[PDB]
Amino acid sequence: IPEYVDWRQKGAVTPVKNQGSCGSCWAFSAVVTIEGIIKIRTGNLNEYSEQELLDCDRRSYGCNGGYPWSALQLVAQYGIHYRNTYPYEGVQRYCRSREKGPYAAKTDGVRQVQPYNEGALLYSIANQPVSVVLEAAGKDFQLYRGGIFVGPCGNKVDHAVAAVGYGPNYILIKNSWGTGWGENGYIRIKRGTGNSYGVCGLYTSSFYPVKN
Numbered sequence: 683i684p685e686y687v688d689w690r691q692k693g694a695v696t697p698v699k700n701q702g703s704c705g706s707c708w709a710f711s712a713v714v715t716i717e718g719i720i721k722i723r724t725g726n727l728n729e730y731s732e733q734e735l736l737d738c739d740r741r742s743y744g745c746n747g748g749y750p751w752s753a754l755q756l757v758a759q760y761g762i763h764y765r766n767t768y769p770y771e772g773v774q775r776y777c778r779s780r781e782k783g784p785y786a787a788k789t790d791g792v793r794q795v796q797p798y799n800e801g802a803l804l805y806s807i808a809n810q811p812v813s814v815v816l817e818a819a820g821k822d823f824q825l826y827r828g829g830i831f832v833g834p835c836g837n838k839v840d841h842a843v844a845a846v847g848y849g850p851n852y853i854l855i856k857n858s859w860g861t862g863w864g865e866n867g868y869i870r871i872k873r874g875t876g877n878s879y880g881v882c883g884l885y886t887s888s889f890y891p892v893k894n
């Protein structure tokens with residue numbers, strides 16, 4: 683795999699979103715990987731509905747948090763609508779997929795990246811954007827304005843984001859805290875420290891959609 687990967691340069695990443703006060707990071711994270719893999723397979727970059735996963739993934743807890751892997755399974759089992767059709771409201775409502783016509787996209791499954799393995803994660807990112815989790819509760823993460831982030835942070839992962847690239851010394855992360863945070867909404871987190879958990883627990887739990 684290459685020394686640098688940046689899925690934004692291959693037109694596979696949509697604009698940075700702001701999840702607002704809702705703990706919907708798991709849905710935002712999942713959607714980034716769906717947007718990425720649909721562009722990779724079909725050549726079209728579309729925005730898909732975080733709100734639909736928020737409303738419809740019964741294994742997750744709406745704005746109280748949830749699981750990127752369960753949202754990803756939902757899109758593989760059923761499908762997902764365009765964001766325009768099912769826009770983000772920042773609050774869990776009832777599942778409205780059936781009121782909004784045919785799904786816009788469907789995936790074929792969900793894979794887990796071997797945890798605690800930097801190389802396995804980089805290999806996955808070289809193929810497509812990946813949903814990853816990290817500890818974002820720390821003030822250093824929250825106040826991040828740029829640079830390669832080394833922490834401090836622990837491994838109490840609490841925040842799903844999407845890895846959309848990497849370099850020799852970082853993994854490039856699309857956050858869902860709006861374009862004012864970090865590097866226009868992105869963070870570069872240091873890699874290659876030998877910490878099996880990854881910086882801020884980044885290697886704890888990583889999933890990506892499969893699309894044939």
Ligand SMILES: *[C@@H](C(=O)O)[C@H](O)C(=O)N[C@@H](CC(C)C)C(=O)NCCC(C)C
Nearest residue numbers: 705706707708747748815839840841842
């Ligand atoms: C993340 C956000 O900032 O919106 C959101 O709070 C969330 O979904 N957090 C989850 C932790 C990640 C590891 C996905 C979470 O806490 N999920 C709850 C499910 C378990 C019982 C922890």
